[PDB]
Amino acid sequence: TNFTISVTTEILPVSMTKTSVDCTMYICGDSTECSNLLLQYGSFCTQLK
Amino acid sequence: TSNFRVQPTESIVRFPNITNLCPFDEVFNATRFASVYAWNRKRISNCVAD
Ligand SMILES: *[C@@H]1O[C@H](CO)[C@@H](O[C@@H]2O[C@H](CO)[C@@H](O)[C@H](O)[C@H]2NC(C)=O)[C@H](O)[C@H]1NC(C)=O
Ligand SMILES: *[C@@H]1O[C@H](CO)[C@@H](O)[C@H](O)[C@H]1NC(C)=O
Numbered sequence: 001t002n003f004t005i006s007v008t009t010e011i012l013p014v015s016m017t018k019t020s021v022d023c024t025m026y027i028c029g030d031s032t033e034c035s036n037l038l039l040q041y042g043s044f045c046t047q048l049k
Numbered sequence: 050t051s052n053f054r055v056q057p058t059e060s061i062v063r064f065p066n067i068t069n070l071c072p073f074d075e076v077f078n079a080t081r082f083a084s085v086y087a088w089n090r091k092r093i094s095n096c097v098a099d
């Protein structure tokens with residue numbers, strides 16, 4: 001016989017902060033010879049990018 | 050494509066220079082030395098690496 005006002009809240013995340021780190025400075029830092037060594041190891045850094 | 054470095058200044062040479070008197074001369078030049086089973090132990094520091 002009577003009406004009651006109702007309201008409920010919902011929470012839904014959408015996106016996070018995207019990150020991009022270069023593999024050479026992440027692993028070997030500033031070592032040029034380490035970069036030369038990982039050049040022939042594979043294309044893993046391209047896959048990560 | 051790539052990344053650009055930070056260019057961290059120019060190479061800094063530190064300042065460790067002290068009196069150059071070291072006990073290497075009197076321990077390397079001697080007419081008699083210790084034996085293998087009992088060797089003399091000397092702590093050499095507070096000078097430069099000759
Ligand atoms: C349904 O219930 C509400 C809540 O009690 C009624 O609202 C009240 O109405 C009286 C007089 O009509 C007021 O004096 C109150 O202050 C009201 N209260 C609130 C919380 O609003 C409402 O009247 C009811 N519906 C019917 C058709 O009687
Ligand atoms: C290095 O040598 C100079 C000149 O002998 C002297 O003035 C200076 O104090 C030395 N450096 C240090 C750290 O003591």
Ligand SMILES: *[C@@H]1O[C@H](CO)[C@@H](O)[C@H](O)[C@H]1NC(C)=O
Nearest residue numbers: 073074075076077078079080
């Ligand atoms: C080396 O040994 C000689 C004698 O064996 C000694 O006269 C001299 O002082 C020592 N030191 C140097 C730096 O020649």
